Design a protein around this nucleic acid. Structure first.
Length: 164
DNA sequence: CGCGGACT
């Protein structure tokens, strides 16, 4: 809904998530979780401590479109049940390391053509589509970007009402 | 010997 979608985005930190394949993104939302690299794992634990909400905006590499956005719900931990990610060349399973469990808010895609007017002040005012994995998006640019996705009636806002 | 590495 439009009433409380802005409530979960208030005082939040946004992070662009890149994936060299769409399979792991499909595995991401099918499992409702995600895992990233140690350098980005460090900063995402930093953001979870200081933000009312940490939004991960997913964009498959070389896809020309976003695949939705989700909310970080917990820090990363090791030793859990294994996830069979499609490892990019030169990436081991230990690189994934900690396990991030997220809550998806919108699963509908968004082409880059619809977000060309949005520039990220924290990436030299470049269009928000441009950026590596873990690139933080400024509050306003991230909030306006989340609003341009089509409404996902399959997801309700009552679940993540007060998970904080 | 497996040793790398998720922008547009």
């Amino acid at each position: 809904g439009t009433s409380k979608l802005k409530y979960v985005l208030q005082d939040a930190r946004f992070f662009l998530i890149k994936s060299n394949n769409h399979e792991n993104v499909s595995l991401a939302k099918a499992k409702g979780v995600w895992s990233t690299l140690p350098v980005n794992e460090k900063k995402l634990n930093l953001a979870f401590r200081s933000a009312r909400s940490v939004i991960l905006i997913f964009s498959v590499r070389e896809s020309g479109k976003f695949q939705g956005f989700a909310r970080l719900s917990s820090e990363s931990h090791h030793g859990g049940s294994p996830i069979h990610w499609v490892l990019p060349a030169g990436m081991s399973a230990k690189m994934l390391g900690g396990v991030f469990k997220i809550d998806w808010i919108c699963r509908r895609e968004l082409p880059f053509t619809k977000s060309a007017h949005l520039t990220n002040p924290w990436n030299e005012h470049k269009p928000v589509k441009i950026g590596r994995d873990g690139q933080e998006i400024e509050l306003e640019c991230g909030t306006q970007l989340c609003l341009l996705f089509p409404p996902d009636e399959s997801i309700d806002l009552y679940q993540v009402i007060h998970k904080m």
